[PDB]
A paper describes a structure:
To gain insights into the molecular architecture of the CPSF core complex, we reconstituted and crystallized a heterodimeric complex consisting of CPSF160FL (residues M1-F1443) and an N-terminal WDR33 fragment encompassing residues Q35-K410 (WDR33Q35-K410). The structure of the complex was solved at 2.5 Å resolution by a combination of molecular replacement and tantalum bromide (Ta6Br12) and sulphur single-wavelength anomalous dispersion (SAD), refined to an Rfree factor of 26.2%. The structure revealed that CPSF160 is a multidomain protein composed of three seven-bladed WD40 beta-propeller domains (bP1, bP2 and bP3 for beta propeller 1 to 3) and a C-terminal helical domain (CTD). The three beta-propellers form a compact tristar arrangement, reminiscent of the domain arrangement observed in the DNA Damage Binding protein 1 (DDB1). The N- and C-terminal propellers (bP1 and bP3) are oriented in a pseudosymmetric fashion and interact with each other at a ~60° angle, creating a deep cavity in between. The cavity is closed on the distal side by three elongated loops (el1-el3) comprising residues P223-T237 (el1), L300-C324 (el2) and C1044-K1069 (el3) projecting from bP1 and bP3. WDR33 also forms a seven-bladed beta-propeller domain (corresponding to residues T108-T403) and additionally contains a ~50 residue N-terminal domain (NTD, residues R54-T107) protruding away from the beta-propeller. Upstream of the NTD, residues Q35-N53, which were included in the crystallized protein construct, are disordered in the crystal structure and could not be modeled. The WDR33 NTD is completely buried in the cavity formed by CPSF160 bP1 and bP3, with CPSF160 loops el1, el2 and el3 locking the NTD in place. Overall, CPSF160 and WDR33 establish an extensive network of interactions encompassing 45 hydrogen bonds and 19 salt bridges, with a total buried surface of ~6900 Å2, equally distributed over the two proteins.
The key protein factor responsible for polyA site definition is the cleavage and polyadenylation specificity factor (CPSF), a multisubunit complex that specifically recognizes the AAUAAA motif, catalyzes pre-mRNA cleavage, and recruits PAP to initiate polyadenylation at the 3’ hydroxyl group of the upstream cleavage fragment.. In turn, CPSF160, WDR33, CPSF30 and Fip1 have been shown to form a stable complex independently of CPSF100 and CPSF73. This ‘core’ polyadenylation module of the CPSF complex is able to bind to an RNA containing the AAUAAA motif with nanomolar affinity (KD ~2 nM) and to promote its polyadenylation by PAP. Here, we present structural and functional insights into the assembly of the core AAUAAA-binding module of the human CPSF complex.
Author numbering:
A (entry chain B): 54 to 410
B (entry chain A): 1 to 45, 64 to 166, 182 to 195, 198 to 399, 458 to 541, 569 to 710, 780 to 822, 844 to 880, ...
The structure:
């Protein structure tokens, strides 16, 4: 029955901007419960990404018919959170009160991939052994399209949103034009079961990660189709691959219980190894505001928080869920992190209140 | 869509204060920096005079001083954005700032992959002066060694990540070490208050002994587990020689010899720090965002977050070991951003949130009382701005074609909150007006504390004498030279005797009767006359110069008469004009001295000492207008050498060449006259008998009135700051004079070109010792918003005050408030209480019983003047004051909004005339974040929606709504369209159709952008959307459906960008002196700028000029303006600097001609474009 509202923090930050040059002018938020109106969004304290370590459980959201949640994504404005479940269902929850809003039978198959275009017009989705579906802002389907004859694991948009790449369980990554429903190019340099794919925010290249032990990570030229390079980052299957918005970093999460960070320009050595988990690492989400902060979730119901400059883990929750965490989604403001796991539930996590024990 | 930027008002927010030997090693002076401005002040014995000032194409991020090996002067270290570092030093030869060196440390390998830098370049200087250090990116410590040819050794960079040095809070060099020992306060495992229960005591200090010869930096000592909320560190000078660490709730003293000494300052330290902290009994404050400086070895003064000034004393043993701390609440002053000690007993508090203050502290274990000696005005930060019509304007100026405008700005913050009333132009308060035909020149003379006795007017065939008393009456019977014209009239003998010079000779009279008259025949009639008591000089149209002296009688009876003293100043070069100068200062040396400045036909200029007539100064090329006049061994129409400032301190040389005005500040340098002259930049345009009229004590102000097509006031007070204020509400003025009368106390009189003589005074309550004439209305509370109601001519000001937070709202269950129960040492949170006052521009006072108090925890998020539909007006609309509020009870409670519509109505009364009437006052489901008007409808952003209402009677009927982004904080509408600004998702362009009652998202900008404020760029037949962002930039977007750059007309396109260098929160537009609108704006640093749309071809011409100026001219600190004006911190440019274009006016005629030759254009074309851009922007 709890709720978190970001408007007071945004208002306090707007009142701060006029007479504060930067964070060295911001007064101290005392670790006391009375200092509730002094809170500001992440953009109000860029020198302290720790504020965005959301380990305070707020609300667990569970469908009437419980199914393992495979993907969670906020709408671009942050109004409603969508959960794509194994029932092929989209469950729309309110982003401020976390109560049930709506539910739609969007897929006949477990929807595995859900992404919003860089422009807030389109939501693209894909299901297990299924199709790519386009969605307007009003959750009305406009196009259903046969993409792969096998399971599609993830999809991502090009910076201009004119094209998108999908990785599937056929060991391939296909690149399509968005305005049409046409298969532009194929990338077949993998073994089997490509489980993650990501498009670069500026440069034209796509990263993929699969079950293969000989070619786990692979870079690709979208327009040409050529394989730029192969990255042997892990021995187990690479579960997620995400490029930081700065365009320089590559983050990976694999079943070998590890997260990894690489410099996109020099791939000879690993830039950083995030070690800290009990089992595999299944999900990763870069923070939308803090450049070095990110969150991860594993086969155990644990989630962790890391910063790029720090070797050790920054924080987290050990029994956050009871199944494996499939998806992590930051609220666009960066103050709420939602987790979608295999235990048929999806939880919301906020920043710790000053004065909490 | 092209435009030019102009700076109408320089920033006034200071940031850095320093005390060093800037000019020489004999006298020390104050050096204060604010954003892009740097100032060097001297102290008078109570006033600060501006000794020097310099502008940069960059924002100073850090400032320091060092004494180099040559030891001529102190060198200044200036940090600039990203990793630029400039060493500069005063140049005694040019009175300028010379660049010793400039170092760039901007390489991506130093950024470790990060693209957004949250660390400013922090410079520290070792006290012994052996090296400097600059922390950049929080990762790279640059070390600049100093010699003990070039005065700097090669720098070297230390990667601090080589220990686990991360998140450096502060760094400071220490006293008493044989190697430069730098202490670094940091935290390896960063934490935040909400997570203090999991991570605390995360701070640490590490001292580094730097050996620059071997580049070895070992750790001499270190400390861990310091309180998580450590804020800064201060190095203690000898002989104590420790380090004082500030922390939000604690004070630490650390040193190698003694274990740490920790003191808790309030109760909040309980449960947050395991560090052993003894409780200070009589103290209950915080040290976050506080400043502090040592007034001696034993005591340091601290200005807190709230302005409290405390004095801390260190208690020591016989071996100087800090045993205890002693605080004393000394006083209360401004919110200090910087602080520095000057001479013993004087302390400067620099502020950007208020007026900076010079204080004098005197003692009476020993307490100190603080006294305000001087203040530096500051109109920043400019939170919001409104434009209105002044309440008082002289009748003679009413019905003027141009509107009389005035700016009202929410300035400052907190206790230093205020309203700033800005007017750029001088308005004359006309007491009376006489219409006198034939009079072309005038003089005012004191009759025998100093009240003018006679007004002497000249006409081609006669002259007129006016007795000045309770009435001004023509004097026909007097013994003046009523017949024939009068070429000069002045005072001699310390205002005892008066002199009237006519083309036939000179006349010495006392009162109304004449005592003496000398006919002067040299072959030509007398055309010019100068008087520097007791010397008089005249010259004819041919070029014959004559000098007379007022000599007292031998018997001491004080009877005086003019004595001829022919000057031996023969030359083969014919004299054009000349002037005399009586020096009460001490600059003119080779103590009252007498000098004659003279211009000749060959183009040279000479200075002679009197009465010996000895040459002491010579410039070979004067009419060219060189930037520095140097001693050696185009028609110069007028010249005047006068002293201004406190007690004739600063000398200035004004020159009128053909259609050109030159100002020269005199400065000491090195038989010959030990003086040089430096050109002063200005935009006064002479293009269309004496144009320069000196005055003293016109309103307590001394200066010079510059006549001509655009008259100006040139003022210098006890502070050596040149003020140039325009006076153009009346036309071109051709004659001016001071006038002190019983009906015109400390005033003036001037002739316009329509033959009207105006006896006027300067309007009171305005400080003219500022970049713009300003009236400061202190509010003692934060001024959030200001709106001008056109129908009533009254301002509605939304403000706030701080109270102790006593309860916590817990449930959005049911509404419950937990009463905060703590102990006495607890420090309560700050809770804002908002109010809406009515203020009248007549007296600039609040209107009684016209104040609206808003609910507890209710924040006013917006307040605008809106024009809503009404059937009682001929135009169909009328004005109200609309306000949107949000009730913020914390994160756990739903934020509900409220809309508040008020009207200012006239009531039978002075200030009682107007009153506030709440026409609408209803709570809204969802927070009300922004509002505006559109075609008589009220548009308001509520939550993540935007609703459009129509107002009928006293109720609001919902007509339209639309889904929007995360948080819309600003909304402005051009007719039919609306533009909304998100906190993170840039701008959105919407349309409202009256036929459909619907809102349609026309287009937007999908790229993320932290918009500060938004407005419009209104060029002829073009519409642009002007946006400011967090990176101090301005961007003009456009909606171009056919451009194809948009995917389908849905993407807004950036067509212009410019790095202004300041945060802009309030715009406003004015018509052009067409269909163009100048888009002015006020910055958060106390400055006013403008964007002026311009034609593409003129833009190309001035862009060529701009590239020439950036590549061919030296710039302070060695910075470059092209890179300064670039985007971020992609670019389409299309916005000219203007501040850089002004330097072309500063070049000499030869330099301008050669520059125009290299460009390929005519100097006259360039000048036409520049002067036209200056002419269009003349407002307020």
């Amino acid at each position: 029955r709890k709720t978190i509202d970001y408007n007071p923090s945004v208002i306090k930050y707007l009142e701060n901007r006029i007479w504060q040059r930067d964070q060295r002018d911001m007064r101290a938020i005392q670790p006391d419960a009375g200092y509730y109106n002094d809170l500001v969004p992440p953009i109000g304290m860029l020198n302290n990404p720790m504020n965005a370590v959301t380990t305070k459980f707020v609300r667990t959201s569970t469908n009437k018919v419980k199914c393992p949640v495979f993907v969670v994504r906020w709408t671009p404005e942050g109004r409603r959170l969508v959960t794509g479940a194994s029932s092929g269902e989209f469950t729309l929850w309110n982003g401020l009160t976390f109560n049930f809003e709506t539910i739609l039978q969007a897929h006949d198959s477990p929807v595995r991939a859900m992404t919003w275009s860089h422009n807030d017009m389109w939501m693209l989705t894909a299901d297990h052994g299924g199709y790519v579906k386009y969605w307007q802002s009003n959750m009305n389907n406009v196009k259903m399209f046969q993409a792969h004859k096998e399971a599609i694991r993830e999809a991502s948009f090009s910076p201009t949103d004119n094209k998108f790449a999908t990785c599937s369980d056929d060991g391939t990554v296909r690149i399509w034009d968005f305005l049409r429903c046409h298969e532009e190019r194929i990338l077949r340099g993998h073994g089997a079961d490509v489980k993650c794919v990501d498009w670069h925010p500026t440069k034209g290249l796509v990263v993929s990660g699969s079950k293969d032990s000989q070619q786990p990570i692979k870079f690709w030229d979208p327009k040409t189709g050529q394989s730029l390079a192969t990255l042997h980052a892990h021995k187990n299957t690479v579960m997620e691959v995400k490029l930081n918005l700065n365009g320089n970093w590559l983050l990976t999460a694999s079943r070998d219980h590890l997260c990894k960070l690489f410099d996109i320009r020099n791939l000879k050595e690993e830039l950083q190894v995030f070690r800290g988990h009990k089992k595999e690492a299944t999900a990763v989400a870069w923070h939308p505001v803090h450049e070095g902060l990110f969150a991860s979730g594993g086969s155990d119901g644990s989630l962790l928080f890391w910063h790029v400059g720090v070797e050790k883990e920054v924080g987290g929750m050990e029994m956050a869920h009871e199944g494996m965490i499939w998806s992590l989604a930051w609220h666009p403001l960066g103050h709420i992190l939602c987790s979608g796991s295999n235990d048929h539930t999806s939880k919301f996590w906020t920043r710790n209140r000053p004065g909490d024990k | 869509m092209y435009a030019v930027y102009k700076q109408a008002h320089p920033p006034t927010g200071l940031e850095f204060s320093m005390y060093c030997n800037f000019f020489n090693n004999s006298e020390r002076n104050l050096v204060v920096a604010g954003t892009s401005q740097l100032y060097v002040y001297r102290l008078n014995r109570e006033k600060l005079e501006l000794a020097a000032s310099f502008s940069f194409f960059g924002n100073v991020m850090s400032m320091a001083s060092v004494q180099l090996a040559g030891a001529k002067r102190d060198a200044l270290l200036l940090s600039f954005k990203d990793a630029k570092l400039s060493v500069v030093e005063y140049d005694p030869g040019t009175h300028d700032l010379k660049t010793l060196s400039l170092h760039y440390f901007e390489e991506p390998e130093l950024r470790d992959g990060f693209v957004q830098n949250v660390h400013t370049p922090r410079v520290r200087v070792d006290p012994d002066g052996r090296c400097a250090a600059m922390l950049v990116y929080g990762t790279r410590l640059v070390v600049l060694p100093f010699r003990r040819r070039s005065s700097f050794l090669p720098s070297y960079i230390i990667d601090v990540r080589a220990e686990k040095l991360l998140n450096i809070i502060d760094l400071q060099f220490l006293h008493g070490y044989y190697e430069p020992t730098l202490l670094i306060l940091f935290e390896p495992n960063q934490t935040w208050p909400g997570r203090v229960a999991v991570r605390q005591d995360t701070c640490s200090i590490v001292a580094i002994s730097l050996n620059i010869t071997q580049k070895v930096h070992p750790v001499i000592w270190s400390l861990t587990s310091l309180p998580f909320d450590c804020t800064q560190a201060l190095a203690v000078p000898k002989p104590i020689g420790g380090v004082v660490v500030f922390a939000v709730n604690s004070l630490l003293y650390l040193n190698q010899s003694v274990p740490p000494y920790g003191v808790a300052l309030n109760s909040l330290t309980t449960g947050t720090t395991a560090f052993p902290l003894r409780t200070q009994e009589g103290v209950r404050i915080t040290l976050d965002c506080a400043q502090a400086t040592f007034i001696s070895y034993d005591k340091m003064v601290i200005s807190l977050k709230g302005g409290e000034i405390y004095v801390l004393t260190l208690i020591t043993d016989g071996m100087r070991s800090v045993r205890a701390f002693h605080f004393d609440k000394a006083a209360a002053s401004v919110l200090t951003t910087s602080m520095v000690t000057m001479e013993p007993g004087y302390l400067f508090l620099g502020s950007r949130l208020g007026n900076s203050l010079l204080l004098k502290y005197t003692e009476k274990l020993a307490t100190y009382s603080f006294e305000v000696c001087d203040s530096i005005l500051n109109i920043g930060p400019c939170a919001n701005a409104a434009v209105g019509e002044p309440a008082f304007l002289s009748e003679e100026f009413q019905n003027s074609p141009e509107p009389d405008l005035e700016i009202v700005v929410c300035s400052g913050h907190g206790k230093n909150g205020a309203l700033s009333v800005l007017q750029k132009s001088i308005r004359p308060q006309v007491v009376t007006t006489f219409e006198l035909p034939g009079c072309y020149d005038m003089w005012t003379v004191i009759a025998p504390g100093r009240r003018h006795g006679f007004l002497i007017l000249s006409r081609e065939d006669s002259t007129m004498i006016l007795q000045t008393g309770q009435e001004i009456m023509e004097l026909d019977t007097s013994g003046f030279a009523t017949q024939g014209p009068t070429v000069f009239a002045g005072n001699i003998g310390d205002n005892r005797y008066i002199v009237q010079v006519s083309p036939l000779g000179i006349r010495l009279l006392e009162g109304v009767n004449q005592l003496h008259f000398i006919p002067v025949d040299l072959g030509a009639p007398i055309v010019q006359c100068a008087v520097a008591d007791p010397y008089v000089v005249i010259m004819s149209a041919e070029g014959h110069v004559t000098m007379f002296l007022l000599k007292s009688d031998s018997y001491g009876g004080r009877h005086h008469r003019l004595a001829l003293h022919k000057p031996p100043l023969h030359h083969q070069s014919k004299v054009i004009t000349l002037c005399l100068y009586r020096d009460l200062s001490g600059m003119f040396t080779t103590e009252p001295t007498h000098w004659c400045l003279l211009v000749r036909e060959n183009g040279t200029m000479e200075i002679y000492q009197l009465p010996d007539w000895r040459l002491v100064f010579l410039v070979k090329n004067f009419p060219v207008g060189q930037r520095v006049l140097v001693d050696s061994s185009p028609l110069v129409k007028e010249v005047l050498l006068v002293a201004l400032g406190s007690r004739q301190s600063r000398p200035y040389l004004l020159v009128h060449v053909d259609q050109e005005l030159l100002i020269y500040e005199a400065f000491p340098h090195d038989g010959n006259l030990k003086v040089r002259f430096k050109k002063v930049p200005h935009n006064i345009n002479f293009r269309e008998v004496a144009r320069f009229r000196y005055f003293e004590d016109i309103y307590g102000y001394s200066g010079v009135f510059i006549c001509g097509p655009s008259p100006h006031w040139l003022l210098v007070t006890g502070r050596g700051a040149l003020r140039l204020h325009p006076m153009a509400i009346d036309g071109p003025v051709d004659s001016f004079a001071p006038f002190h009368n019983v009906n015109c106390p400390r005033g003036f009189l001037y002739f316009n070109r329509q033959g009207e003589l105006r006896i006027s005074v300067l309007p009171a309550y305005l400080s003219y010792d500022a970049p713009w004439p300003v009236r400061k209305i202190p509010l003692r509370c934060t001024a959030h918003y200001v709106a001008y109601h056109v129908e009533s001519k009254v301002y509605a000001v939304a403000t706030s005050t701080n109270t102790p937070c006593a309860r916590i709202p817990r449930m959005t269950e049911e509404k419950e408030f937990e009463t905060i129960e703590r102990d006495e040492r607890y420090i309560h949170p700050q809770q804002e209480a908002f109010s809406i006052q009515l203020i009248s521009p007549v007296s600039w006072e609040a209107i009684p019983n016209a104040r609206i108090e808003l609910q507890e925890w209710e924040h006013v998020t917006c307040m605008k003047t809106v024009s809503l539909r009404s059937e009682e007006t001929v135009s169909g609309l009328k004005g109200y004051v609309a306000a949107g509020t949000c009730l913020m009870q914390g994160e756990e409670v739903t934020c509900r909004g409220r809309i508040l519509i008020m009207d200012v109505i006239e009531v039978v009364p002075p200030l009682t005339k107007n009153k506030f009437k709440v026409l609408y006052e209803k709570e809204q489901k969802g927070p009300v974040t922004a509002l505006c008007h559109c075609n008589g409808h009220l548009v308001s952003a509520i939550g993540q929606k935007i609703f459009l209402w129509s107002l009928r009677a006293s109720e609001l009927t919902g007509m339209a709504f639309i889904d929007t982004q995360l948080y819309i904080h600003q909304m402005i509408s051009v007719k039919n369209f609306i533009l909304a600004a998100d906190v993170m998702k840039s701008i959105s362009l919407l349309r409202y159709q009256e036929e459909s009652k619907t809102l349609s998202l026309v287009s937007r900008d999908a790229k993320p952008l932290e918009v500060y404020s938004v407005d419009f760029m209104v060029d002829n037949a073009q519409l642009g959307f002007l946006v400011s962002d967090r990176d101090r930039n301005l961007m003009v977007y456009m909606y171009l459906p056919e451009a194809k750059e948009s995917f389908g007309g849905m993407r807004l396109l950036r067509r212009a960008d410019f790095h202004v260098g300041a945060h802009v929160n309030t715009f406003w537009r004015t018509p052009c002196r067409e269909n163009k609108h100048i888009t002015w704006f006020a910055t958060l640093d106390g400055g006013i700028g403008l964007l002026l749309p311009m034609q593409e071809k003129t833009y190309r011409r001035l862009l060529m000029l701009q590239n020439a100026l950036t590549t061919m001219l030296p710039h302070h600190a060695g910075l470059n303006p092209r890179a300064f004006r670039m985007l971020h911190v992609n670019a389409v440019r299309n916005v000219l600097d203007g501040e850089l274009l002004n330097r072309y006016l500063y070049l000499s005629t030869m330099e301008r001609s050669e520059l125009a030759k290299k460009i390929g254009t005519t100097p006259d074309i360039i000048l036409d474009d520049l002067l036209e851009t200056d002419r269009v922007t003349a407002h307020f």
